[PDB]
Symmetry: C3
Subunit: 608 residues, 3 copies
């Protein structure tokens, strides 16, 4: 069946991923979008794009009728579901078949047979794959470790495997770092591991990519857990170690062609790692965070370094969709070298505007047990104390660099003003800070954490700066240069030279260097701060848009700080609102079952 036009029934990075390969093959691409995704990267990337309705996925990306209607209207011969949404929906895959549209994935029978745990285990046990597990009175025989096999099938029924991936490093089951191949598994053991899975794949004559998830013990005995009837999120680590494009194979096999390479042809070189980037706050129990990507600098990409990004600077993460920002994958000759490359690369990644898991991934990828390959499903719970750590006071050299950056920003502003003046060469336009027969010393104040740091900066005739912090003096000289769109600060402190990325947003100075990142706060004059800002806040504002599940306060009720007022469920996450003050409650703005928008007043308190 000639696939010349494909509809991508998904959004974000996976839609861009599929479109890349479709365009590389000369296949025309159709995007779908919600009202919230109208300006998304996958819409601009497609050859055609169609609106499927409002921002909630139940009314857009999960609306089978709208997706089929767009596939008909665009004359797309095939639908690529990507991952999540309709990719594991049996009714949607059968509807595509009824409508004469090629579903690029497994048959509706394989989706249904794998969607029910008891059914899937019974099929896997009958296929030879082990079916042991701990179930409710529930105590898992083998709780630790997670190892999965990429398997590929065809309409013909021929089946192949692609080694294995370690996904043991998970937080609340959510996979965080994936690696391929899984460390410490012998080529012989993995070959046997895949072959038992391959027989099951032939048994269901699975067509398209499938993944057999195994639980592996400390002795490398493995048992079947489940089969994900889709492309996995972490498929890039497999692609990096095999040199295959799994989406390209999905399109070819959905068109009816046989598997491109024999098992003998497949060869393994090197090791690869993947670390998903998540709009989460690790310090606040990995709460998801929504907000703008005010800065989104990225590491330069090379064949080893792949940035799977569906978002661009200025994009806003949405409460409706998944919080992932990007996925970073690397390939290297050795696993240790790959770990080193990922950590250097992570430092180059910069995200300002919302909290992310990047610093958590840096701590995790540098943990001694992770470096050793001693991974299991409880790794994050077990090493929670080390993986999460507090801020430490900055060094005086960092403060000197921050002051130099502020001074250079002022100099740049002066040059910008000079550009538009008729007098372009007046000595007054210089930033020398020069005086007659004396030297100018500037008293600057910077805040590091809660500490105010006083810096005495002296403008030298030669153009350097002498900075004194407490009893120590530093000789500082540097300049600003631009690489791409990022301003870089090149400075030398007491003869030590270094380079860092400088961003000054609001009253915070951001310095990004391969050593680390430091934030310094510029004190805000009181006058500029609004004097007498409005007081008497009206109750904690809803953490997010969610249904009100419980109300504990009547119209007039005396409450003390810490008295629960309301309970709200948002995206299946319970939050309890607590009393800010000991004041009696004047009124309540919401009742039980009401949906309250983010940051909307919940309770009114009597003025005291």
């Amino acid at each position: 069946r000639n696939i010349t036009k494909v509809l991508i029934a998904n959004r974000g990075e996976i839609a861009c991923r599929v479109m890349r390969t479709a365009k590389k093959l000369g296949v025309q691409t159709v995007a779908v979008y919600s009202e919230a995704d109208r300006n998304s990267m996958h819409v601009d990337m497609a050859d055609e794009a169609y609106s499927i309705g409002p921002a909630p996925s139940q009314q857009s990306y999960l609306s089978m009728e709208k997706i089929i209607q767009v596939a008909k209207t665009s004359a797309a011969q095939a639908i690529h579901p990507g991952c999540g949404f309709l990719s594991e929906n049996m009714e949607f895959a059968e509807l595509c078949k009824q409508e004469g549209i090629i579903f690029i994935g497994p048959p509706p029978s394989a989706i249904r047979d794998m969607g029910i745990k008891s059914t899937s285990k019974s099929i896997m046990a009958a296929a030879g794959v082990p079916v042991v597990e701990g179930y409710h009175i529930e105590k898992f025989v083998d709780t630790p470790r997670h190892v999965e096999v990429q398997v590929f099938g065809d309409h013909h029924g021929n089946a192949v495997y692609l080694f294995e991936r370690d996904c043991s490093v998970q937080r609340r089951h959510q996979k965080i770092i994936e690696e391929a191949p899984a460390p410490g598994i012998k080529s012989e053991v993995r070959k046997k591991l895949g072959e038992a899975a391959v027989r099951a794949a032939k048994a269901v004559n699975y067509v398209g990519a499938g993944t057999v998830e195994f639980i592996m013990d400390s002795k490398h005995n493995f048992c079947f857990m489940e089969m994900n009837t889709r492309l996995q999120v972490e498929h890039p680590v497999t692609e990096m170690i095999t040199g295959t494009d799994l989406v390209e194979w999905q399109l070819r096999i959905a068109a009816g062609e046989k598997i491109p390479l024999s098992q003998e042809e497949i060869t393994l070189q090197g090791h690869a790692f993947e670390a998903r980037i998540y709009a989460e706050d690790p310090s606040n129990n990995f709460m998801p965070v929504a907000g703008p990507l005010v800065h989104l600098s990225t590491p330069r990409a090379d064949p080893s370094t792949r940035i799977e990004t569906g978002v661009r600077q200025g994009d806003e993460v949405s409460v409706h969709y998944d919080p992932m920002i990007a996925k970073l994958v690397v390939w290297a000759a050795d696993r240790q070298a790959a770990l080193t490359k990922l950590r250097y690369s992570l430092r180059q990644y910069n995200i300002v505007g919302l909290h992310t898991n990047i610093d958590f991934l840096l701590n995790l990828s540098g943990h001694p047990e992770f470096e050793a390959g001693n991974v299991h499903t409880d790794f994050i719970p077990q090493h929670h104390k080390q993986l999460l750590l507090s801020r430490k006071a900055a060094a005086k050299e960092s403060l000197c660099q921050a002051a130099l950056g502020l001074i250079l920003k002022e100099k740049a502003m002066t040059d910008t003003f000079t550009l538009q003046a008729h007098d372009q060469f007046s000595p007054f336009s210089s930033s020398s800070g020069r005086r007659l027969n004396i030297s100018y010393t500037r008293n600057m104040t910077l805040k590091d954490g809660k500490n105010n740091v006083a810096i005495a900066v002296t403008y030298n005739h030669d153009g350097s700066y002498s900075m004194q912090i407490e009893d120590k003096t530093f000789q500082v000289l540097g300049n600003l240069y631009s690489e791409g769109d990022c301003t870089y600060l090149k400075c030398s402190v007491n003869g030590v030279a270094s380079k860092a990325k400088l961003i000054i947003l609001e009253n915070t100075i951001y310095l990004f260097s391969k050593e680390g990142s430091i934030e310094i706060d510029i004190p805000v004059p009181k006058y500029l701060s609004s004097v007498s800002s409005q007081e008497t806040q009206g109750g904690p504002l809803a953490p997010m848009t969610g249904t009100i599940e419980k109300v504990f306060v009547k119209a007039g009720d005396k409450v003390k700080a810490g008295d629960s007022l309301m309970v709200m469920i948002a995206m299946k996450m319970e939050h309890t609102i607590k009393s800010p003050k000991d004041g009696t409650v004047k009124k309540v703005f919401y009742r039980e079952g009401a949906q309250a928008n983010r940051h909307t007043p919940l309770v009114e308190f009597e003025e005291e």
Copy 2:
């Protein structure tokens, strides 16, 4: 023999092609040029360039004496003849040898022995290659099909073949689409096909590239037709399937080195296609057209996509030289995928200023029998009904996009004017079209073919546009962005988003999208049109510069519309001038045997 400097005794794409490889090898390059080619791409590309006289090729590129004189003056050790001109001239190849200059091609004996059909057939029959043919009482035993083999020989006499190419798709013998390998020929059959040709190549000890042209029947029996004693035009499809550079091999073998790879070393991967871009009007019986390349946008080039272009935007096609504009070749894993890639690529190619065969190539490459590989030499005559088709009325969405493009062009002009004004931020400089307490509705008229379309455009406050055509309303919003040197229009009509290349030349709006290309005409106000433009045209103007072969009208003769007045031959193509009016002939400006320049008055008619 050390070839450190080569003269290229040719022009256009083939001169650039040879110079590319010569420069890649560190060989110095000498161009020759006519007065008409002084600013041609191959002149600017060479390390040295020499004038060889006036525009007619008989007095320039065919002047053996001038080419030899330049080779001596530039101290070029070798001459590369390319294809056409002196490449198959035996006297020129012998003259190069007499003058101690290396002719990069076959020996003068092989050129002469292949230049006479009876001689070439007798040699081929004696070499085992089959001699059958239909000749005058002429009825070809096998008229259909044209399969040819790339063969390479050396001074040593070793000979190799490079699979085969299908050139069956030809119009008036002129090859139009070529493919390699030829579809439906088995690897075993082609191996035998090449081996019989190889024995003939050894028999004439042919040195340099040669092509054995075969006629193949529906049973895959093949018979020798002729041997072209040169590099073929369509050699790039062979290079794309073998990974060889045939010009590089020609230079090495002309220097005296042995063939680089053994027959065992040669391997075949994938399939490739080549389409020739011709300055022709398919709707007017494929008449050649001369004129400026006002726009010459091209598809981006990748290793699979090769643009063999000797012309650049603003170049003028010449009546003296060949009308080819460029050749497009693609390589793919499968032949069907290659056909898809070529068609997508052809849409990206844009040519404005003269008629081309590109839309004919798009229809041909999408014909069901061509997709099946059911090709033969009569394919174009047999399918002429479908391959050529009429214009169809445009959709209302296309008209909306054209109106949006016109409005955005006006906005860009407004911004350009604003740039030079002292009031850079006045609200008047906006293109909002805003009114107080009412909405501005603009009545625009556009011409699609012969139909005038009335569009009522309403300027909305948000910046969008509401366009009404007949009884249908469309919500239109978009903007202009630049990629390279091409302006692109990004628009959304009724929620449907699309991208297209926008060009507004004279009174025509050109919209190029992967769906297709649409031209919309902006009506020309009568006042601007010169009122009372001069009437009484003096006879049809010569279609081109050509000799007058016949005159049918005396100084005073009464003629009726359709009465032939004169017959003119131009580049061996007969045109008969016909009487425009029933008026009696006042005078004749030319007599028989005179050469009449293009667009010069031929007959004077009495004023009535």
Copy 3:
């Protein structure tokens, strides 16, 4: 041992070379610098950089204590010594080991055992490698052909070789052109040659790269000369023929990993050449020259063409450090093709501001005996007659091109002035040189060598120029275009078109074309030349900063021109100052043992 941070205990190109590979592997890089190197390319290239004191290498790059202190302060786990300085210092390698820092090189024992000729010969003779030599009463059998083998060892003791390199083309033992493989040595002979060296490498269990230097006779008998216990300067020719990175192997092996590829895996393809760009004057007996790199244009780099440059335009060569400017290496399918590519590339290299050996390398690489591969250690002395040649008078076409370049520079200046004027379209701003009813003829004078050339330039209406030199007239037309940062002149003289790089510095016009380079001097008006410039120069100025070893003149002494006044040693090179005039000596500014700075007056002569 995990090497995540490396200190590079070197400067210039080799520091940049090591940092390239370290950064490619994700290893952090620490530079060291002297006060003179504060702005050097390797300082800006490193992730961290530290000052090691003043410009003299004895107080900076040879200060073991400072290098170890920086390695400790930066927390570098390893030191890469590069080549020269501390790379062959046994005490430094032992000090690194005592301090727990990985020395990236051979063990201190191997450095010491190879540093003494008698010890090294005794070890080599015991290892089977031949010991024969001519020693003092010192004489040899025949002129040597220098052939050396790249050998690599590991801590395990496994040893491998990498074919061989010809370094026979040397001036005063200084290697000038190196090639790999060495021409005329059979693969079998080289295999045996390497194997005898490999046994010695195993005998000292050498770890890291080593080179066994052999003397080879005209019969290809070879004898051990010495073993350089470091990376060789000319290692890039080996890398180009093997496809290996020897610095990458040095880092891996210093970390403790086994050799990456087996001897069976290693394969040889093509041939490669390396020429060293020296700041030397070949015409003045290859005296080293210090000064600014005012222009440093370079050939474009491709995988075959590697520019190993540690200097950038505007960099100043230093008296303290080595005079090398850059090293040029090429790889080709054949040795003859590689020689052609290097010569074309050398012409593209442009160096203005100091004398270089580039024209000497062009003459050498084009010498018939060098083209034949008839090289030996006396090649430069034997052929000194041809390799060094005088300037030849320029052709009239070159003078025409120079005049055209001057005129176009004036036109560019006129356009620059016009840019800032309110009247931007006045006809006066044109450079037509037009007159009413007559033609403007300009009398220009240019100096070629010692000859003044009078050129009569006539400004034609069409924009061309008619230039008459003596009795010959030339029709000249051209324009200026910019490629990158280099201005190019495109001109046509009497119908002959050519391109050249144009630079006009001070009063000299530099024209660079693949044919050659020509300098034309613009006469300096007398008035602008300072009239009555100060006379009575006070003795020859010190050729460079050096100790005064001898003084031959008392406070009042009568001397005649050519009477030696003082002897000075600079960087171990004796210069004798001679009397400029027959005047009696008024005074002496220096005594014996004093250090005299460059260009400082040495003797005062009585006014006459």
